[PDB]
Amino acid sequence: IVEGSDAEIGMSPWQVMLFRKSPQELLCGASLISDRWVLTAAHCLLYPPWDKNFTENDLLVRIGKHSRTRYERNIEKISMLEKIYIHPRYNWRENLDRDIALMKLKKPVAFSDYIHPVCLPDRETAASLLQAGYKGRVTGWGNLKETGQPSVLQVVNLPIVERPVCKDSTRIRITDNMFCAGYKPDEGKRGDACEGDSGGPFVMKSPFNNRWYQMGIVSWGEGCDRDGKYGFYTHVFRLKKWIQKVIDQF
């Protein structure tokens, strides 16, 4: 997160860290959607051009954390992965279209003041909230600047951007499975996701029922917080069908 600030404790209880097991390293962010299911970005798990093809045994997750480094006794929980599910139409050769992935935990985690799932949006909620100019919130332990690592989880509020501005901001072919967000150069504020924040949630608090909904997954960008560029997020609702299918099948 570039140009963000420190999250308060318990501000984002669905935040999950995704580690490679051996050697242990923070690879990505992710979110908790139930006691046993975790959402993340597909390229965090599979990205051949960079020699990435992780399976269940290569990864672990940590839930309920605030500080990147220091251990938080009786707060944070660790879990292994029972199953990994990539979207079958994930396009890593072109533009990261459908950059989404589901991970089923070996053992359900217990909720607490620090561990609590985020809502997935229904149709009405998505139609109401994914509107240009409307602001969502992005969280992660990723880089603070374009290539540096925060001590505590970072948070930033960013407006959704009109689809034509998104199209004209990049020569990469964008799809309806993507949305972009960030401030325009004119608006005089800054903020962006950055390398390492992939898989983190783009959330919005619904004025109708005061529940937080995950509309997006940090997916990709060209640089971080560059003027005229925007960060791009996997459109969660557009793939919700797939999510439900997977969860109901397994």
Binding site: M11, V118, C119, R137, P207, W212
Partner: peptide, 27 residues
């Protein structure tokens, strides 16, 4: 489920430092 409602904020009738920015954007 019980989703999207935070123990330390919504369940304690307490506003997070910046969520009002989101609400006020929703106009």
């Amino acid at each position: 489920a019980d989703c999207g409602l935070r123990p330390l904020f919504e369940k304690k009738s307490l506003e997070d430092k910046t969520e009002r920015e989101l609400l006020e954007s929703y106009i």
